[PDB]
Ligand binder design. Structure first.
Ligand code: NA
Ligand code: NA
Ligand code: NA
Ligand code: NA
Lengths: 146, 146
């Protein structure tokens, strides 16, 4: 695997979400100026944001993480077993992950999204997923201006 | 390309939808016992069903096509330039397609979906897209029991 450390965690997170009836995308943009490492979508439309921190420095750089809260029902960190997990915010959910799997060790508290916002984000997720899929199946089949 | 004839049309349809800000999936299941060749999703949540008929016999077999109507805002046929297009229902939309591109030659009439149904179908589309994407990016990363 030539995946970067964050991509590795996200692979394991995605495997684990899928094993439990969720689906996911990577590098999702809920609003201008924000990007989340993994967005998970539950079978009833539950929205999870998972930030994959591959190092303490990676975590130090996500200082405005509380800004992700308004864009999800549940917010989680995902780190590997070498990460000092006790330093993460107590109120957050937590997964321990690697490139091959993940486990939730602390379930995030539920801060449900309003109906209109849930709609916008599901539409964005759909769009993200379907674009990336089409591009993998048909690499030449789009233009530079979209 | 080792794509079957219907898959070829669907490739061209998908390219063309994407060029105009739509996204798509293939072999979409809106309800038990139905499957549509291409589902298109518009940037405002418009739902299009496109049936890709590669032969007159293919069209003859889609006799219950009026059953697709309740699952979309707009219903289209997609055929190649060798197809006797005049034989298709007058009320339907029409694309002429091949493996490389497509064009709408007749815009389908709008029969808008109810809000609750639009939601269900967008959720299904999201789920379909994201599963297939994850499986292409990580072939081994799921189990046989989902
Ligand atoms: Na992705
Ligand atoms: Na990261
Ligand atoms: Na597909
Ligand atoms: Na077909």
């Amino acid at each position: 695997l030539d995946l970067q450390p964050g991509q590795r965690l996200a692979r394991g997170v995605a495997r684990h979400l899928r094993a439990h009836g969720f689906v996911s995308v990577e590098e999702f943009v809920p609003a201008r100026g924000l990007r989340v490492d993994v967005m998970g979508l539950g079978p009833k439309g539950e929205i999870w944001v998972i930030e994959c921190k591959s190092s303490r420095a990676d975590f130090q750089a996500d200082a405005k993480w509380q800004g992700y809260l308004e864009w999800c029902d549940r917010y989680f960190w995902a780190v590997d077993m070498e990460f000092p997990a006790e330093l993460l915010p107590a109120e957050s959910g937590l997964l321990i992950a690697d490139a091959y799997d993940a486990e939730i060790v602390r379930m995030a508290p539920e801060q449900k999204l309003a109906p209109a916002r849930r709609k916008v984000l599901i539409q964005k997720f759909a769009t993200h997923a379907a674009r990336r899929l089409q591009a993998l199946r048909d690499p030449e089949g789009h233009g530079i201006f979209e």
